[PDB]
Amino acid sequence: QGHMVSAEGRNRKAVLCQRCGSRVLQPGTALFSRRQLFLPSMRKDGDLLQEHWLVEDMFIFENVGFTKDVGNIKFLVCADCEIGPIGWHCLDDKNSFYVALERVSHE
């Protein structure tokens, strides 16, 4: 919204950890997505979120952590401070990784 999504639907801004500023994604590396996904709280239960960056290969991420499998899901966390979930991946869909905008910052 604003100078956030390009005409092609890509992220205009870098995506950062809100807590430590680790760079998760470079600009232009992801597509805006309104798919509804459940993300457990980053503390202490969670939110149904529907604004995400959709990334098509794990190696497009600049810096990110993956949790061990929880069923066929892996959650994404900050590589540096490990706060998360900031994102979500279903292993059955090899080319779809979601970073929730509410859970990150943009520079």
Partner 1 sequence: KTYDYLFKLLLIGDSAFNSTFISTIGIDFKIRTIELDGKRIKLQIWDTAGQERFRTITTAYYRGAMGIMLVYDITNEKSFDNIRNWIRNIEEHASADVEKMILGNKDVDKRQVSKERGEKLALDYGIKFMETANINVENAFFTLARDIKAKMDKNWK
Q: Could you tell me which stretch among 18-26, 52-60, 64-72, 84-92 binds Zn ion (CB under 5 A)?
A: 18-26
User: Which one of Zn ion, partner 1, none interacts with residue 17, CB within 5 to 8 A by kind?
Assistant: Zn ion
Closest residue by Cα to residue 55 from 33, 22, 75, 36: 33
User: Which one of partner 1, Zn ion, none interacts with residue 18, CB within 5 to 8 A by kind?
Assistant: none
Q: How far apart are CA 87 and CA 25, in angstroms?
A: 12
Contacting residue, 22, 49, 98, 104, with Zn ion by CB under 5 A: 22
Q: Rule CB under 5 A: is residue 19 a binding residue for Zn ion?
A: yes
Q: How far apart are CA 3 and CA 73, in angstroms?
A: 31
